[PDB]
Every structure is written in structure tokens, then in C-alpha cells.
Design a protein around this ligand. Structure first.
Ligand SMILES: C[C@@](O)(CCOP(=O)(O)O)CC(=O)O
Ligand SMILES: C[C@@](O)(CCOP(=O)(O)O)CC(=O)O
Lengths: 303, 301
């Protein structure tokens, strides 16, 4: 008869977004922007977050409701009160939906003693995102479960960079599905042109793998800038993203690029700790909601 | 008193990749350099820069044109008055245009009898003497006009579109920009060289789109080309702001034209949306020049 709190981090793409869906490598990096889910025993099912208080509700709380629906089939959950707080803004490729999924599983696993392992939690989180989105990659829930720097799809763990991470949100809503659809149709229109560009994005991630293992942050940011041009060439860049990205580079960032589907949302700037604040001021001065964070090895943890 | 004009040009696709044996598509625009040539007591060359004599410093291309040509038919009193609406830099062909417009103006009065052929060979050999070394592409496109592929040098039909050139006002050294791309290519050759091939592939596809008049596909291939150049590091904030403002205003496509690092962008518009696009580029802070493609190179005005 008590309460339990769990948190799971978000992530940013160092390299390789959009190209993964065509079988190329990418490098995801968990950051210290987390979603907390606090769980208590209750008479009925209640979920409260930024967008209000609901019961079981697949319109407002689809991921948390799906988690409850699934896990109640092994150990029955007749009542629970879940409170969701997050530093990960819904939108862009920061993994907010995967963070709340993993944290909801972790809290319930602790509250009702499901005894699930971290591997089982990541596998369950992937299935939750499939039943909510129709089809989902296991990448988001895996990185939010284990933290750190993970390559996709090999799941190679790399050394977490001793770096600052500046996230500039353009405020435009990043609708992932249509941007992935826009890239696919561009790929279909010019196959011999776009498909090699997908090979080049994968080539960047494989080169960047050693640079992440070597700690060469200046080379990493340089390759991030090359990755940004290819993402721009694929059509997922916008004026606001370009303005935040170039403002961050001018203020001394190693590199800056879109993170996620693009077409709005957030960019990411890898900066040395000494340059975080002035990079954050430049992105803000360019009209961007700035978040100063850093990578993390901590995935799902019990608060 | 005669007057001749030669046009500038813009790159539809392929800049920066031509050095590494790739294809490019230049398109002459209706921005021309017109020089008045008449008879005078001394060889006087006037411009917006000023009125001088035979000055190989303030008038490098015009004065060198005088020297190479007078060795066949001696000239001693000409009043050259260059006038141009071609912005300086960004490979817009300002130096190439002022060259052939001078050669054609002297070929008129003093009767040199040069072909259109010869006005291109001499117009390129003179750029070899002025800036030490130069490519004949900038020169030829100013002589014939229209859409010209490089290096295959095939002429294509002119797209019935508008051209919005947006100057950022930022200076950039093309020598440094080419060398920077060169260093990046040698730092990651297995990565950057395929990007050079992709640019050339855009030019090959774009050739069929220029022939078919698929202006919308040309524009979206321009947007792809722009991302590749941005990946090579030749893009800046000001260029990106002008490019995306043109796209949001309805242009078929927008991209850097020339070396990048500043300088000018270019936007392909439907003829009706040409002013709407130009207003957005100016509203984004660009020095706008409204123009359109031309099929005529050097003409005796
Ligand atoms: C759009 C995509 O390329 C990256 C964005 O990831 P997310 O859906 O924002 O978590 C998805 C993928 O790579 O599979
Ligand atoms: C980038 C580039 O295509 C720009 C050409 O402009 P210009 O007419 O040479 O000034 C030159 C190059 O191919 O390196």
C-alpha cells in the first residue's frame, strides 16, 4: 500500500535517421531529458499528465493505456493512479512516446511485482508502440530502456560522449508519418539518385562509430553537419531548423543537425561544456526553445 | 558608335562537382553586359568604376581585350562604356560577359570578322591571361546562350520560367571554398566522392527534365542539389534563409548558384509567381534581381 516512481530518458540521433528504414546504420544517444511515471494503488484506473486527467483513454493517453491493457492480462490490475511528468516535448525525434511507454512499464513492474527484466521491458515496450502506431521500430524503446549510445540495428554500445547537448525546438509540429512518406515517394521518384544518398547516410554512421569510440567530438560534429546536408537533400529540413542549426554552429558548436523525422521539431547541437550557454543563447536568439542537456548511460531507473 | 551585349548565367545543377569530372547544366539569363564602342582620340574606357585609359588593373578584361585584338587590326582611339546588370561573383558570368561584349563591340566598328566560334575561343583565352587560368564554360555560355550542359556541351531548350537571383551580400573566396571541399573530399573520400557522383547524376536526370519541360521536377532536383552542396559545407545561414523563403513563396526550386559560402542563391519560378517569389526573398533580406532565361548570347544591339 504505497507508491512508486520510474523514469526513462529520451534520445537524439547523432547520425542516420530516415535511412534506417532502408537498412542503413544509425547512432542513437540517450540524453538526460526523462519522463517520470509515478504509480499508486487505486480503486479505478486514472492517468493524469500534461493534457489532463483520464481513465483508460486511447485518445489522450494511448501509450499508457496500452501498457495497462497488456500487462493486466498476466497480473490483473483493477485499479492504479499513474501520473506522468516529462521534460521531453511531444513532437520531433526526441522519443517522448517511447520514454513514457518504458517508464509506465517500469512503474507497473515495480508496483505489482511483474518481475520483468530490462530486456523483457524493451521487448514489451516495442509491442506497445506497435499496437498504438500499427507498426513501430524497436529502436526507440530499446534506447530509452538501456540508455547510452546505441547503434541501429546492431545495438552496439558506444562510449557516452563527455559533451553538452543543446536542443533547439522550433515549435513546429514534427509529424513523423508524413515525412517518412515524403522521403519514400522522393526515393521512388528517383531511385538511382536517392538510394545512394541513403548509402551515404549509413556510411556517415559507420565512420562516426569510431569517432564516438575515440571521443573525437570535433570530427563527430563535422560529420553531423554533412549528415544535415543529406537530410536537407531528402526534403525534411525547414527554414526554422536551418536558422537554429546555423546559429548554433556560429556560436561554437562542434556540429548541429536535425534529430528525428525533421519537417519541424528540434535540432541537436553537440557542444563542448564551455560553449553550452552561448550556443543556447544563439539558438534562443534565433527564435528557438532551447534545452541544455547531455548524454546519459542511465536508461530506465527506479526513482 | 556600336553597342554589343552578352548575358550572364546561373547553374541549374552541377557546380563544385565539375572539377571532379561530373556533369553540370548552366542556363544563360537575360542579365547582360552592354558596352558602347565608338571613335575617340585616345583609347578611353569608362565604367561605373570610372573613366581610365588602357588600364590592366581597373579594367583587366576590357583592356586585355584591347591588347590581344589590336595585334591584328590596330586600334588607337575607342570610347568603351561598359554597363551591366549582372551582379558580381557567384559565378554569374560577370567577367565572362564583359569579355565577349567587348570583343563583339570592336568586331563591329573596326571590322575584325570573327565568327561566333572565335568570340568564344578568344573570350576564353583572354580569361586565361587575366585571372591566370579559367574554364571555357563561363565564356561559351555567354556567347551562344540558352541551356548548355558541361562538359558534354550540348544545348537544351530554354525553360519558360522566371529566375529570381538573391544576393546575400556576403563575400566568399571561391579559391578557399574549392579548397575546403577538396580537403573534405580527401578526409573522407569513400563518403564525399559518392556525393560528387550524386551531383553529377542530378545533372544527367535534369537534362531529360529540361528537354521535357518538367519545371516542377527540375525545381525539386534543385532542392536535392542544394542539400548536397550544404553537405559539402558551401552553404551559410543567409543563403538558407533566402532559399527557403523562395520555396515557401511557391518557387519550383531554390539553391546556391556558384561557389557558395555566401554570394547568390537562385530560384526557379513559374512566370506568374516570379514577383511573389522575389518579394519573399527581399523580405528575407536578399538583394533581389528579377530575370529569366535567355536563348540569345552575344548580340550586336
Ligand atoms: C523518422 C525516423 O527516421 C526517425 C524519427 O524517430 P521518432 O519516430 O521521432 O522517434 C524513424 C526511423 O528512423 O525509423
Ligand atoms: C564551385 C564552382 O562551380 C563555381 C564556379 O563559379 P565561377 O564562374 O568559376 O566563379 C567552381 C568549381 O567547380 O569549383
Amino acid at each position: 500500500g504505497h507508491m512508486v516512481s520510474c523514469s526513462a530518458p529520451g534520445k537524439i540521433y547523432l547520425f542516420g535517421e530516415h535511412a534506417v528504414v532502408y537498412g542503413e546504420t544509425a547512432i542513437a544517444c540517450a540524453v538526460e531529458l526523462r519522463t517520470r511515471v509515478r504509480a499508486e494503488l487505486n480503486d479505478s484506473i486514472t492517468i493524469q499528465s500534461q493534457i489532463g486527467r483520464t481513465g483508460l483513454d486511447f485518445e489522450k493517453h494511448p501509450y499508457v493505456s496500452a501498457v495497462i491493457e497488456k500487462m493486466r492480462k498476466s497480473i490483473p490490475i483493477n485499479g492504479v493512479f499513474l501520473t506522468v511528468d516529462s521534460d521531453i516535448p511531444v513532437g520531433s525525434g526526441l522519443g517522448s512516446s517511447a520514454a513514457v511507454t518504458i517508464a509506465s512499464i517500469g512503474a507497473l513492474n515495480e508496483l505489482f511485482g511483474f518481475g520483468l527484466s530490462l530486456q523483457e521491458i524493451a521487448k514489451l515496450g516495442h509491442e506497445i508502440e506497435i499496437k498504438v502506431q500499427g507498426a513501430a521500430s524497436p529502436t526507440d524503446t530499446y534506447v530509452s530502456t538501456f540508455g547510452g549510445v546505441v547503434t541501429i540495428p546492431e545495438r552496439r554500445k558506444l562510449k557516452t560522449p563527455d559533451c553538452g547537448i543543446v536542443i533547439g525546438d522550433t515549435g513546429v509540429f514534427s509529424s513523423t508519418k508524413e515525412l517518412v512518406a515524403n522521403v519514400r515517394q522522393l526515393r521512388e521518384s528517383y531511385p538511382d539518385l536517392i538510394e545512394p544518398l541513403m548509402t551515404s547516410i549509413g556510411k556517415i554512421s559507420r565512420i562516426g562509430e569510431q569517432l564516438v569510440l575515440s571521443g573525437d567530438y570535433a570530427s563527430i560534429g563535422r560529420l553531423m553537419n554533412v549528415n544535415q546536408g543529406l537530410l536537407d537533400a531528402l526534403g525534411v529540413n525547414i527554414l526554422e531548423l536551418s536558422q537554429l542549426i546555423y546559429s548554433a554552429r556560429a556560436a561554437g558548436a562542434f556540429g548541429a543537425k536535425i534529430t528525428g523525422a525533421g519537417g519541424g521539431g528540434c535540432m541537436v547541437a553537440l557542444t563542448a561544456p564551455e560553449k553550452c550557454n552561448q550556443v543556447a543563447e544563439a539558438v534562443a536568439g534565433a527564435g528557438g526553445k532551447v534545452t541544455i542537456t547531455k548524454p546519459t548511460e542511465q536508461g530506465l531507473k527506479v526513482d
